[PDB]
């Protein structure tokens, strides 16, 4: 399984994801970005089955980019979460559902920063911190231990690295490299890759 994590602070929505994509026993790509940018200030971290991720997240990326073109202003992160939740929910009763586990993360000029969670059944939940994959089972309790709601963005990188070192020590899959990027009020920056 592939790994997602998000840490919301007072003004930043720090997210990370692995850079590995795997077939059966080999792994095929060593630098695979699983993060899709939708606006200047929101992302969408999508994992799940083969194929359904790049078909759903590209569908949500261009329909939210279509909202910016028709209107000039971009969607809020809350409305982009409910737009993502709306499409994933009403297709799971159709003949072609999607098996994508999402982690949406954006900043808003009025409402502030926001991290969103949904499973493959499209149950949207706003969380201060969330994670996906089998590696979520290890790393949520480092986050349940050391997360204050007012954590600085430099103490959130070191909180992120404690979670990723737990995957190096305890998790059975080789997840050596991670893409890390921050979503403060100035947009989507890109922190240096945490690798081991």
């Amino acid at each position: 399984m592939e790994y997602l994590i998000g840490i919301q602070g007072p003004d930043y929505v720090l997210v990370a994801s692995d850079r590995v994509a795997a077939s059966n026993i080999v792994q095929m790509k060593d630098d695979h970005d699983k993060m899709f940018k939708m606006s200047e200030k929101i992302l969408l971290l999508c994992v799940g089955e083969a194929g359904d991720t790049v078909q759903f997240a590209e569908y949500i990326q261009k329909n939210v980019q279509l909202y910016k073109m028709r209107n000039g202003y971009e969607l809020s992160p809350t409305a982009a979460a409910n737009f993502t939740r709306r499409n994933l929910a009403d297709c799971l009763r159709s003949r072609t559902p999607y098996h994508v586990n999402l982690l949406l993360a954006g900043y808003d000029e009025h409402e502030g920063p926001a991290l969103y969670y949904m499973d493959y059944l499209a149950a949207l939940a706003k969380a201060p911190f969330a994670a996906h994959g089998y590696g979520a089972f290890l790393t949520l309790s480092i986050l349940d231990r050391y997360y204050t709601p007012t954590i600085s963005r430099e103490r959130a990188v070191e909180l992120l690295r404690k979670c990723l070192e737990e995957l190096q020590k305890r998790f059975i899959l080789n997840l050596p490299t991670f893409s890390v990027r921050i979503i403060d009020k100035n947009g989507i920056h890109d922190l240096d890759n945490i690798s081991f």
Partner: protein
């Protein structure tokens, strides 16, 4: 030309001012939504047409205002609701639209029957519109307008366009749309508050 609804934009609210027209005496004075049709929690409208084709145009705007809210869980911005009907009318009545959204603040629009809209600071549609469009262009401080100063302008330009000797205090339907404590309030003003603006005009204009 049937209605006489007019919009006025202010710094802290927009207001529609429609007149209740009753042709025959045996028409029932309806106690329902008469002239100012509320579209969702932060936007209202008014039509220049008969109250049967009003119920087609407003209950189509309310489908668009709730297919948006079902899809994004946010209230619709007060230009996309104007635009989506103007796309439907592009494929036969003129409207006004008052509302508030977080993008461009207090808004006022005017949909042509051809399918064209425009943002107005104050305008009129319906009976004797150009008689009162010209009267608004005389006296409207385009930016220095308070709500009550806009509200006194409404019953000023309605006393020179409708009726005889009382400004039809029980037949004029001012609704104001304000911001208060985060939510959005739409106040169809009551008959006691609508009568006193006639009283505060007939005293101030005679003196």
């Amino acid at each position: 030309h049937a209605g006489t609804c007019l919009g006025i934009l202010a710094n802290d609210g927009v207001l529609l001012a429609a007149e209740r027209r009753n042709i025959h005496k045996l028409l029932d004075e309806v106690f329902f939504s008469e002239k100012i049709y509320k579209l969702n929690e932060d936007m209202a409208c008014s039509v220049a047409g008969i109250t049967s084709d009003a119920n087609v145009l407003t209950n189509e705007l309310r489908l668009i205002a709730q297919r948006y809210l079902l899809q994004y869980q946010e209230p619709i911005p007060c230009e996309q609701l104007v635009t989506a009907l103007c796309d439907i009318k592009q494929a036969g009545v003129s409207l006004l639209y008052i509302g508030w959204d977080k993008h461009y603040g207090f808004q006022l629009y005017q949909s042509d029957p051809s399918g064209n809209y425009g943002g107005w600071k104050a305008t009129c549609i319906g009976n004797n519109s150009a008689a009162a469009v010209s009267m608004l262009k005389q006296d409207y401080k385009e930016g220095e307008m308070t709500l009550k100063s806009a509200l006194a302008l409404a019953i000023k330009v309605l006393n020179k366009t409708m009726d005889v000797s009382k400004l039809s205090a029980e037949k004029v339907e001012i609704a104001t749309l304000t911001r208060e404590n985060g939510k959005t309030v739409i106040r169809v003003l009551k008959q006691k508050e609508v009568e006193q603006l006639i009283k505060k005009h007939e005293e101030e204009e005679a003196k």
